[PDB]
């Protein structure tokens, strides 16, 4: 195969603005790169085919360019409809036709996350499992991770995080790291901490709770 690498990972613009997307390759793919717009809950659609061409029905705000490895899709006057996920595909070394991992044109500063922790219920603790939850509220940028700790014992891979899309106003993100233990192992311990590390915090931050 041939690797197609897109970026930005996401565009955050309000209508009217100009959005520039990029699709880079590992080899020359000539002027054989196509673009795909995939509105929400819908199906992929042909935008610019070959790198400058606009398939039937496509407006002019969509402009394509590049030759070789580096390309660029350009949407000059963003419209509420143009807010979708844009894909790039190469049709040089066929097969396999490889695709770019996407770019989402989303709508409408470094803020340290506000941390909270949530002890397990009881209605849960009867089935036999305990789910401790950590919450990292509204923070920028995204990159930031959680290290759970069961009595100052770095924990490994028994947690699972989720992240909201970028808020339109704050320009932030949120995160739900859930540590899942047995009720037994749970009763077998003491301090349940969640150490948060993030760019907007000169000092790492913790939130704990003896049970």
């Amino acid at each position: 195969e041939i690797v197609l690498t897109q970026s930005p990972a996401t565009l955050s613009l309000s209508p009217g603005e100009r959005a520039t997307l990029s699709c880079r390759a590992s080899q020359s793919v000539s002027s054989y790169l196509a673009w795909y717009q995939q509105k929400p809950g819908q199906a992929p659609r042909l935008l610019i085919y070959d790198a400058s061409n606009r398939a039937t029905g496509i407006p002019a705000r969509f402009s394509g360019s590049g030759s070789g490895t580096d390309f660029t899709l350009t949407i000059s006057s963003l419209e509420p409809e143009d807010f979708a996920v844009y894909y790039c595909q190469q049709r040089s070394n066929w097969p396999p036709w490889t695709f770019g991992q996407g770019t989402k044109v989303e709508i409408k500063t470094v803020a340290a996350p506000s941390v909270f922790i949530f002890p397990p219920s009881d209605e849960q603790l009867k089935s036999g499992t305990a789910s401790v939850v950590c919450l990292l509220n509204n923070f920028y940028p995204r990159e930031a991770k959680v290290q759970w700790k069961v009595d100052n014992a770095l924990q490994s891979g028994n947690s699972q995080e989720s992240v909201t899309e970028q808020d339109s106003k704050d320009s932030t993100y949120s995160l739900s790291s859930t540590l899942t233990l047995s009720k037994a192992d749970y009763e077998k311990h003491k301090v349940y901490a969640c150490e948060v590390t993030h760019q907007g915090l000169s000092s790492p931050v913790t939130k704990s709770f003896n049970r």
Binding site: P44, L46, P96, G102, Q124, S131, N137, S174
Partner: protein
């Protein structure tokens, strides 16, 4: 033109399925057909191809001796007989028309999921509280807060498939200390609607 799929549903590791992309709007024979797929959350991955009459066929790796494409140039449809189905394959299947390697026309997709139970909702006590929607299949879910009243400060987190195959998400709200709070959880896919007060 109109490329439209069928065949999707739930199937478990081992079993197989068969789709089909029926054609209208055109002369289905003068074009090469395609199969592309979107694994929930990820992006685009092409799966296989077939030509004008049907002798040439190149597959994506990750398959064959598993995936087998075909077509009936007389009644206008495109086929894909999946077998050996795995988790990895859980995805939305598209069939695009070839131009070349130029899928100039797509279909609305069909969903194939590889894995039926309702969620066990538990409470998570400015402040911050929420609900833990746990162990349910399949997706999706919807969590409201106070029947649509509490909207500002809500963060329903995208969910996480677990080692069991039962999804579990979280929805949290940030409220100014000091009023009753209830989260409205509804798993339309299994008829499990659940409210849970929070204190």
């Amino acid at each position: 033109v109109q490329l439209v799929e069928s065949g999707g549903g739930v199937v478990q590791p081992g079993r197989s399925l068969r789709l089909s992309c029926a054609a209208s709007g055109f002369t289905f024979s003068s074009y090469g057909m395609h199969w592309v797929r979107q694994a929930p959350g990820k992006g685009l991955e092409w799966v296989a191809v077939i030509s004008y009459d049907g002798s040439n066929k190149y597959y994506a790796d990750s398959v064959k001796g598993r995936f087998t494409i075909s077509r009936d140039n007389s009644k206008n449809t495109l086929y894909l007989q999946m077998n050996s189905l795995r988790a990895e394959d859980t995805a939305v299947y598209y069939c695009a028309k070839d131009g070349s390697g130029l899928l100039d026309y797509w279909g609305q997709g069909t969903l194939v999921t590889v894995s039926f139970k309702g969620p066990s909702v538990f409470p998570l006590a400015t402040a911050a509280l929420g609900c833990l929607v746990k162990d349910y299949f399949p997706e999706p879910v919807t969590v409201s807060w106070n029947s649509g009243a509490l909207t500002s400060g809500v963060h329903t987190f995208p969910a996480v498939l677990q080692s069991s195959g039962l999804y579990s998400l979280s929805s949290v709200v940030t409220v100014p200390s000091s009023q009753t709070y209830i989260c409205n959880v509804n798993h339309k896919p299994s008829n499990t609607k659940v409210d849970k007060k929070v204190e």
